[PDB]
């Protein structure tokens, strides 16, 4: 059958009809034991010299609040001016939420500006099983992109969930599972996270956080020798 046609007929997005979405849990349990305690800092990132966030990170998850999520917001002008290369480790990874509009282009510019090359394009595909427009848009937009960048030298590149309630800007927690299953290192930064996103193994920084516990000397102590080079998937 033609699900494109079906969507025109009924309003059920084609992804509504995708189906089905052995000790790969021991990997998850190693992640859990290696995880640092959750750390978090309230900071207005427009006004905040990010160089105060130390040491340099192995993974950066960047989730700037785009205007299009809502139907202060950061524009791609603002985002491109973040000095992400000043806190990234020489070999490190970025996951940048780009939305579905011009961000798919301007996010690639950001990645190259900060010194990465895009190695994956992860799409969050939103179903509307429970509920059967940009002026430049040619099609109804039913997904978002999270770009993965790499600098220096099990999962699939799709997340499928139901479209969240209007006004809900959360991204699927599956993005964390994908990032953590890569075993990229233990210094993990989430910029523009919220109270709702704080998580073991992660440093969360955002303007809406209600509480802070970040201390740079304490944070670094989690990675002092003999723990400087752990993958995040090893025994403690």
């Amino acid at each position: 059958n033609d699900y494109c046609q079906h969507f025109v007929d009924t309003g059920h997005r084609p992804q509504n009809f995708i189906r089905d979405v052995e000790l790969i849990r021991l990997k998850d349990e190693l992640i859990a034991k290696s995880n640092t305690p959750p750390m978090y800092l309230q900071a207005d990132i427009e006004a905040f010299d990010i160089r105060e966030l130390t040491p340099k990170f192995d993974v950066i998850l960047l989730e700037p609040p785009l205007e299009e999520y809502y139907r202060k917001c950061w524009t791609w002008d603002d985002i491109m001016k973040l000095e992400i290369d000043e806190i990234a480790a020489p070999r490190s990874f970025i996951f940048l939420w780009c939305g579905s509009g011009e961000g798919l282009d301007l996010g690639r510019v950001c990645l190259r500006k900060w010194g990465y090359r895009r190695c994956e394009d992860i799409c969050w595909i939103k179903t509307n099983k429970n509920n059967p427009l940009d002026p430049k848009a040619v099609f109804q937009r039913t997904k978002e992109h999270c770009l993965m960048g790499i600098k220096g030298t099990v999962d699939i590149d799709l997340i499928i969930t139901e479209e969240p309630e209007i006004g809900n800007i959360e991204k699927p927690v599956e993005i964390f599972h994908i990032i953590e299953h890569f075993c990229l290192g233990r210094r993990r930064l989430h910029l523009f996270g919220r109270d709702s996103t704080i998580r073991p193994g992660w440093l969360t920084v955002g303007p809406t956080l209600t509480n802070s516990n970040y201390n740079a000397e304490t944070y670094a102590s989690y990675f002092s020798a003999p723990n400087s080079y752990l993958t995040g998937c090893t025994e403690e």
């Binding site: 025109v8 799409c123 997904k143």
Partner: protein, 197 residues
């Protein structure tokens, strides 16, 4: 005009200006990731094919970036991005991550009028077939977007030929042209056939 038409050619060397203007261009190029170098891709004479319309550009790997480059070089702005979720017959999905999709950049040129923007959504769910064979659903999406207008496909194979479409590719069988304005300009430009150099 209406029925399928095609030209076996080397797209690098055909004088595409005999074909006229098209509401839609679609291409599935042999990116260098029988391929074309990045300069040959950049040099392709896409700009003459359209005045106001849309371009559909299949990309994988580093062509996700290079295709954006060609897109802009040829004079398009990328305004959408179709994702084809690849499934089997049971509607289940088929370096760092395994790939469940392929991307089709959508560019706009000029100011198109009379198109039905917003009828379809930017996700396709369709079975995998032979390799490099894109799903037929795209022709339905494109027809509903721009019904009855002239369309051109670059790097198509015999199964890609469709009504309202002119298909170009080097694995087509011969030259099948029906539009009088096209056969006219083809005879003038190519009085003996032959599309070399």
């Amino acid at each position: 005009l209406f029925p399928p038409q095609w030209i076996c050619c080397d797209i690098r060397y055909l004088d595409v200006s005999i074909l006229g203007k098209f509401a839609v261009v679609m291409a599935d190029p042999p990116w260098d990731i029988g391929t074309l170098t990045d300069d040959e891709m950049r040099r392709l004479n896409i700009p003459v094919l359209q005045d106001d319309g849309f371009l559909f550009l299949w990309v994988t790997g580093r062509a996700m970036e290079l295709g954006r480059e060609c897109l802009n070089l040829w004079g398009y702005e990328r305004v959408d991005e179709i994702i084809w979720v690849k499934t089997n017959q049971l509607q289940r999905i088929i370096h760092w991550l395994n790939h469940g999709k392929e991307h089709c950049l959508v560019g706009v040129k000029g100011n198109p009028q009379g198109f039905n923007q917003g009828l379809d959504c930017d996700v396709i769910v369709a079975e995998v077939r032979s390799t490099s064979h894109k799903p037929d659903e795209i022709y339905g999406m494109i027809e509903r977007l721009s019904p009855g207008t002239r369309k051109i496909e670059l790097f198509g194979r015999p199964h890609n030929v469709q009504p309202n479409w002119i298909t170009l590719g080097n694995q087509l069988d011969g030259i099948h042209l029906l539009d009088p304005d096209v056969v006219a300009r083809f005879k003038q430009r190519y009085p003996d056939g032959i599309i070399s150099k």
